Design a protein around this ligand. Structure first.
Ligand SMILES: O=C(O)c1nccn1CCn1ccnn1
Ligand SMILES: [Zn+2]
Ligand SMILES: [Zn+2]
Length: 231
């Protein structure tokens, strides 16, 4: 069963096997007086591992590396952060110190610097316009346009039909927008349709936070976003 927020003390990290060679990682973190869970992705990249997103903080990200070594035992050689917030880049300096080459779009790198967050070393080219897709080892990186944030990316693992939606995709049980301080509410439904059109065969959809689902999470997220806009 997928680990839940109450089951993970802040500072620990769980790995969840989605498919052969694909894991989510789940951590927990305090934010404005409550503790939330957060998802990232791990994908076998030949004899190496590709990491999608930090574990939301330096201490969680160190635990993430320890759990990976304990349970998978292959070296994390590259990391992609899918937008500039701390659940995505917080921990990039621990990654860098551990030997991991860290990556993000130029937009994400810039926004991280402006926010005072940690900054991935390397710029990902080919993602500057909505609908852009690039291959990055065993995954496809896709920029659907502005949504949860203006820079947010999604990730697809073709070998397993795994779509990592990041914070642009809400879990089924989440019915309120919550904090959308950096969101483009007007563009968000448009961005989700680009995801739907580009990955119609996705079988596993992973939100940025919470329980995995299927393509229903896309329609679900548009419903939430639009309701927050009509009141
Ligand atoms: O909304 C987000 O994606 C987010 N990321 C970090 C903090 N937040 C807000 C609080 N939150 C987390 C999960 N659910 N709500
Ligand atoms: Zn965010
Ligand atoms: Zn988030």
């Amino acid at each position: 069963e997928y680990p839940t927020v109450s089951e993970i003390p802040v500072g620990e990290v769980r790995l969840y096997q989605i498919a052969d060679g694909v894991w989510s990682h789940i951590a927990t973190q305090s934010f404005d007086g409550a503790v939330y869970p957060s998802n990232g992705l791990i994908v076998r990249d030949g004899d190496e591992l590709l990491l999608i997103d930090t574990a939301w903080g330096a201490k969680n990200t160190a635990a993430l590396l320890a759990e990976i070594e304990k349970q998978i035992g292959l070296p994390v050689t590259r990391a992609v952060s899918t937008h500039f917030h701390d659940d995505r880049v917080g921990g990039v300096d621990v990654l860098r110190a551990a030997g991991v080459a860290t990556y993000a779009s130029p937009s994400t790198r810039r926004l991280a610097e402006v926010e005072g967050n940690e900054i991935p070393t390397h710029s990902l080219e080919g993602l500057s316009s909505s609908g852009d897709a690039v291959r990055f080892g065993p995954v496809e990186l896709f920029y659907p346009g502005a949504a949860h944030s203006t820079d947010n990316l999604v990730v697809y693992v073709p070998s397993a039909s795994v779509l990592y939606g990041g914070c642009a995709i809400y879990e089924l049980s989440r019915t309120s927008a919550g904090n959308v301080a950096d969101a483009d509410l007007a563009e968000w439904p448009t961005s989700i349709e680009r995801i739907q059109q580009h990955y119609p065969e996705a079988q596993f959809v992973i939100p940025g936070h919470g329980l995995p689902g299927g393509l229903d999470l896309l329609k679900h997220t548009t419903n939430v976003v639009k309701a927050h806009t009509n009141r």
